[PDB]
Amino acid sequence: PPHGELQYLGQIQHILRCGVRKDDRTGTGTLSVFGMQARYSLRDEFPLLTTKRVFWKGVLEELLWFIKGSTNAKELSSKGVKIWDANGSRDFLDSLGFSTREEGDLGPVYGFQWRHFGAEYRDMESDYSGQGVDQLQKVIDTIKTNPDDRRIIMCAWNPRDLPLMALPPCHALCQFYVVNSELSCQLYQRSGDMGLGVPFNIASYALLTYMIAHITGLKPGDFIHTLGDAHIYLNHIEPLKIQLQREPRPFPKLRILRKVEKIDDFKAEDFQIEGYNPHPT
Amino acid sequence: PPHGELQYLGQIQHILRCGVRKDDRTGTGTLSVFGMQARYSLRDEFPLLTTKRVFWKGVLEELLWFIKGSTNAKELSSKGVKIWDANGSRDFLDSLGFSTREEGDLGPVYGFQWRHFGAEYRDMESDYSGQGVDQLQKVIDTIKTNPDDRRIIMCAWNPRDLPLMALPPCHALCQFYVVNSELSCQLYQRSGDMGLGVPFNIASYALLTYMIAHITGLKPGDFIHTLGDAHIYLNHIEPLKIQLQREPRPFPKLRILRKVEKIDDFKAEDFQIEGYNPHPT
Numbered sequence: 001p002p003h004g005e006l007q008y009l010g011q012i013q014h015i016l017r018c019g020v021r022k023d024d025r026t027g028t029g030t031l032s033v034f035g036m037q038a039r040y041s042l043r044d045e046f047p048l049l050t051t052k053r054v055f056w057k058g059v060l061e062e063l064l065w066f067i068k069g070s071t072n073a074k075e076l077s078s079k080g081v082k083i084w085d086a087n088g089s090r091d092f093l094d095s096l097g098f099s100t101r102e103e104g105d106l107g108p109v110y111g112f113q114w115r116h117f118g119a120e121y122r123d124m125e126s127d128y129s130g131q132g133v134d135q136l137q138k139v140i141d142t143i144k145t146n147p148d149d150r151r152i153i154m155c156a157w158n159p160r161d162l163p164l165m166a167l168p169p170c171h172a173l174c175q176f177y178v179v180n181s182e183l184s185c186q187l188y189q190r191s192g193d194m195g196l197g198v199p200f201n202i203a204s205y206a207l208l209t210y211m212i213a214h215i216t217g218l219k220p221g222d223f224i225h226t227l228g229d230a231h232i233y234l235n236h237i238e239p240l241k242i243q244l245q246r247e248p249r250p251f252p253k254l255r256i257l258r259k260v261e262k263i264d265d266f267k268a269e270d271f272q273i274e275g276y277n278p279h280p281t
Numbered sequence: 282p283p284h285g286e287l288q289y290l291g292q293i294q295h296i297l298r299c300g301v302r303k304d305d306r307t308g309t310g311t312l313s314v315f316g317m318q319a320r321y322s323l324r325d326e327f328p329l330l331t332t333k334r335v336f337w338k339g340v341l342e343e344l345l346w347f348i349k350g351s352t353n354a355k356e357l358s359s360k361g362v363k364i365w366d367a368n369g370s371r372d373f374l375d376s377l378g379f380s381t382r383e384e385g386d387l388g389p390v391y392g393f394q395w396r397h398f399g400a401e402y403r404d405m406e407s408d409y410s411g412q413g414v415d416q417l418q419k420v421i422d423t424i425k426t427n428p429d430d431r432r433i434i435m436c437a438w439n440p441r442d443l444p445l446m447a448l449p450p451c452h453a454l455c456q457f458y459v460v461n462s463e464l465s466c467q468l469y470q471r472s473g474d475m476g477l478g479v480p481f482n483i484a485s486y487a488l489l490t491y492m493i494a495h496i497t498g499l500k501p502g503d504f505i506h507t508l509g510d511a512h513i514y515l516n517h518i519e520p521l522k523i524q525l526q527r528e529p530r531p532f533p534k535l536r537i538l539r540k541v542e543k544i545d546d547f548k549a550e551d552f553q554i555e556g557y558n559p560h561p562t
């Protein structure tokens with residue numbers, strides 16, 4: 001079967017041949033296409049792009065970070081992952097109108113939405129136990145008791161909380177599917193930076209399927225990446241052109257060195273990526 | 282210029298060929314595929330499927346019903362459309378534990394989420410002016426003020442309001458896109474019956490896009506249909522195969538007779554479908 005990465009390179013290709021010019025908040029300018037969908041098999045392999053090294057440590061840590069229900073950039077920073085510190089800075093907070101908010105506090109972002117959807121938000125350092133709808137755990141429960149369910153969904157898009165956020169969620173929602181004891185997941189992404197972003201997202205949710213599959217006794221199935229506004233910044237054009245020529249190398253494999261019973265007991269040491277030979281950067 | 286209805290007929294074909302068996306809530310078997318996508322042009326044509334007649338009056342009347350933020354089945358029923366009456370019956374309610382609810386009261390469904398997302402749902406008679414977030418309106422405002430924005434989303438999936446609904450929503454969320462004065466919409470359906478549902482849904486949101494484009498002064502672009510669980514009942518595999526051999530007829534045209542400026546000011550008399558000649562069956 002053709003390499004799984006071709007699906008992704010094929011999209012960069014499309015955006016370059018049919019992508020119309022569009023601007024972002026700043027006005028940097030990009031080439032955009034609206035409405036894309038890619039399929040990545042998770043059966044005995046892991047969709048960790050090879051044409052360009054992906055920040056694996058970042059993916060793993062950020063996911064464990066969401067799982068906890070944390071909305072503090074600091075807790076993720078103190079792990080070597082700074083991808084969220086920029087939004088937790090002292091100025092950025094006031095820039096949007098959050099002066100009373102302590103530095104680091106991102107607001108009711110991802111994590112919060114997954115474990116306490118609909119709960120009155122207050123501050124990053126607070127207890128929310130038994131508050132709001134715990135979607136993540138509900139999903140696990142359903143997959144275990146009624147795998148045929150067609151309404152197994154995790155929604156991070158909360159219209160009423162959007163204001164109180166450092167940045168709207170790029171991942172509006174994800175849906176799970178089970179058939180022949182095989183767990184699949186589809187992610188809806190409102191906007192994606194094909195250049196240096198989508199690759200990290202593909203792995204984030206690919207990992208999330210793996211974890212859930214592990215605690216539900218199912219086998220990883222398919223990961224469907226659905227995009228809204230898929231764009232490439234005008235400057236990443238050249239860099240990607242030489243990347244489209246690089247031949248994709250066999251995807252690595254993710255092994256779970258331990259046996260976990262609950263989604264919360266997952267440790268960063270519990271995982272291991274073998275056969276990951278990315279292209280030089 | 283490949284006919285639009287082929288994208289759709291293609292999907293059914295794909296399900297028959299690659300789909301697997303999967304039982305629904307009642308135990309009935311379906312041929313299921315998880316993860317699908319089609320693109321429909323809204324330029325000078327309306328994607329009202331021709332290989333089989335679609336209940337247009339139902340499509341138009343129902344949408345006008347959502348714009349009103351109504352949640353009373355009887356309001357829609359007293360218009361000639363009975364697609365929701367079943368969930369409003371005294372009997373249906375009781376079994377769900379809504380013995381206090383009145384006949385017709387569906388709960389915090391589409392209308393409600395669209396105009397009062399987050400608001401505390403009382404009953405189908407209550408007034409919610411100013412309560413919750415009016416997503417429909419917010420979408421429309423944003424198209425005008427910040428067309429390049431990538432947050433133009435309208436979510437109908439409210440984890441918190443689930444237990445109060447007659448049934449979970451099928452249209453999780455929809456995203457809009459604006460480029461080169463063209464208005465596009467993507468819809469994410471968690472699940473859809475390719476035979477009865479999907480055709481109806483396609484039309485419904487194509488209509489919505491026409492409306493919002495009309496009000497914002499933009500030209501309808503594309504309508505992207507994203508699916509989660511695309512299924513077909515096993516007992517329909519035969520009549521479907523027969524329909525799959527039907528040659529799609531030219532898509533009809535949609536015309537808004539009078540100029541409207543506000544989304545609430547739309548009335549059924551303002552629309553007209555011309556050139557709709559579906560396959561008799």
Ligand SMILES: O=c1[nH]c(=O)n([C@H]2C[C@H](O)[C@@H](COP(=O)(O)O)O2)cc1F
Pocket residue numbers: 024025168170191192193197198200201431432
């Ligand atoms: O996982 C990520 N996904 C992503 O899309 N962005 C950025 C890339 C893009 O430049 C920005 C767009 O934000 P918006 O759609 O609000 O304009 O989102 C960053 C991440 F870490």
Ligand SMILES: O=c1[nH]c(=O)n([C@H]2C[C@H](O)[C@@H](COP(=O)(O)O)O2)cc1F
Pocket residue numbers: 150151305306449451472473474478479481482
């Ligand atoms: O507009 C509609 N779209 C739609 O897909 N369904 C039905 C078709 C499918 O048989 C059912 C599945 O519901 P569930 O996923 O809860 O089993 O949704 C009903 C509508 F009114």
